[PDB]
Amino acid sequence: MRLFYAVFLPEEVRAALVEAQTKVRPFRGWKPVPPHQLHLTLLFLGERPEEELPDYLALGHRLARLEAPFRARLRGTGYFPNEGTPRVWFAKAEAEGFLRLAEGLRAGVEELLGEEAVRIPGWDKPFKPHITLARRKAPAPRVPPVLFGLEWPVEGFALVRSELKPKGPVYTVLEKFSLRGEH
């Protein structure tokens, strides 16, 4: 299983983002992310053996009970790579809470994997709270920045499986976790 932890989004957030995606329909080189897949990843795990499921599940429940629901703000768009042909178009979101959950999980995964966690794809990348809007499958141009200024309540996150299939990746939520922490 190819697994990752992520935050799914509420209606007003998906709609603001779906209106954003709009600037990109004239460009067939842009592949827009289906609204119900729009999400912010806190930690990608790559291919993991089934034997580890319980540990990722327990890790989720642990972190969930230690951290409280927090407010996030959607704020501006960007591309990767920053210069040259872009690979991705994403929205920047921000909040201490995303960083705290990302740290909490990298920590748990290290305890469980030790040295092996380094081999996880993109493990060394510094966490950037980003929400992908579209991916560049063919030539397409950058579009001007999209400012959002939209605050919303983050109440939990999930452990999700991704499977590459025809039309693209199909997501299955193995579990949702509710932020219930006192902190």
UniProtKB/Swiss-Prot annotation:
It comes from the Bacteria. A motif (HXTX 2) lies at residues 130-133. The active site is at residues 39, 130. Disulfide bonds: none annotated. It catalyses: a 3'-end 2',3'-cyclophospho-ribonucleotide-RNA + H2O = a 3'-end 2'-phospho-ribonucleotide-RNA + H(+). Keywords: Hydrolase. A motif (HXTX 1) lies at residues 39-42. Hydrolyzes RNA 2',3'-cyclic phosphodiester to an RNA 2'-phosphomonoester. This is RNA 2',3'-cyclic phosphodiesterase. It comes from Thermus thermophilus (strain ATCC 27634 / DSM 579 / HB8).
